Amino acid sequence: SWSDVVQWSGTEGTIGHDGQRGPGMYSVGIAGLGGWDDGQANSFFTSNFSSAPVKYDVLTEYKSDAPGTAFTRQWNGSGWVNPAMVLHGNMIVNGTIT
Amino acid sequence: SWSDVVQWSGTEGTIGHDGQRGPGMYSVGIAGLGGWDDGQANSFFTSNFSSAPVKYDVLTEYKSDAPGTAFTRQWNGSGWVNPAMVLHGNMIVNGTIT
Amino acid sequence: TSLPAKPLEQDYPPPGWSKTPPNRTDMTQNIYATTGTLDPVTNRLLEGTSWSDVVQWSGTEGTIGHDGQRGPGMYSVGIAGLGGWDDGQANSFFTSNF
């Protein structure tokens, strides 16, 4: 009888992976914000980016009704940590110019 | 004579597709803006991103000479629609703080 | 995963080899086949003849291609002690984050 059926021609390769997505100096607001929200930040990225945040990702969270209350954190690839030196144009919090 | 020429070795696969591009809370201005411009917004993405806008994409359009005139829309994957809750730090339009 | 060395043993099959093409559970690996003159009386290779040069016999997985490019945005970043546009700092920003 016929032998065991075996592949004879070439095989198409699978889908690989390419360069990672690039973040930006974003600025988003959350209603009723009293502090930095890791959950809201993660939800923002999951909803829009369709991918996890990447290394050195900077996102700014603030309460719009009182623009002084603003929080900025840097994603170092595993979580949100306080960045060493991040300075926005909206860094004027307590209405003071010296 | 020789038989019909047929492939004998493996075949390289084609190029697949990977995770989608991630948007951000962008803020762009258009000269002479009297309202939200779908065409200008699409031209902005086509020129810079080199790709179509993705789901939950937020872009802010404003007239720089009068910063109060600002418009923000969310791209829900098929068009620009009014977002449910988007609140920027520049949401102060009519010079009023209450 | 690579081209095996030519078998030296006259056994059918030689050590490390199988008479029938084994199932390719791992796609990255390839089925390599070599041929020789078999003696049915001894169930081994014919005296004075050996296995042919080892050649690929099954399909080959393709390499990783490239897809649509990353999309930028209307970003706004600050640098301490800035007296003018900094190409080096801008490039460092993109290399670190993007």
Numbering used by the authors:
A (entry chain A), B (entry chain A): 540 to 637
C (entry chain A): 491 to 588
What's the publication's text?
The T5 family of viruses are tailed bacteriophages characterized by a long non-contractile tail. The bacteriophage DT57C is closely related to the paradigmal T5 phage, though it recognizes a different receptor (BtuB) and features highly divergent lateral tail fibers (LTF). We present a composite map determined by electron cryo-microscopy (cryo-EM) at resolutions ranging between 2.9 Å to 4.9 Å of the entire T5-like phage particle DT57C, and atomic models comprising its core structural proteins. Our results provide a complete atomic structure of a T5-like phage, provide insights into the process of DNA ejection as well as a structural basis for the design of engineered phages and future mechanistic studies.
Finally, DIII comprises two fibronectin type III subdomains, which serve as connection sites for the central tail fiber protein (CFP). To obtain a reconstruction of the CFP region, we re-extracted particles after shifting the center of the reconstruction towards the capsid-distal region of the tail tip complex and performed a refinement with local angular searches. Even though the resulting reconstruction did not allow de novo building of the CFP protein due to the high flexibility of the region, it accommodated well a predicted structural model (see Methods section). The CFP trimer is connected to the TTHP with its own fibronectin domains. Being separated at the proximal part, the CFP monomers merge together as they extend away from the core of the tail tip complex, forming a straight fiber with high β-strand content in a 3-fold symmetric arrangement.
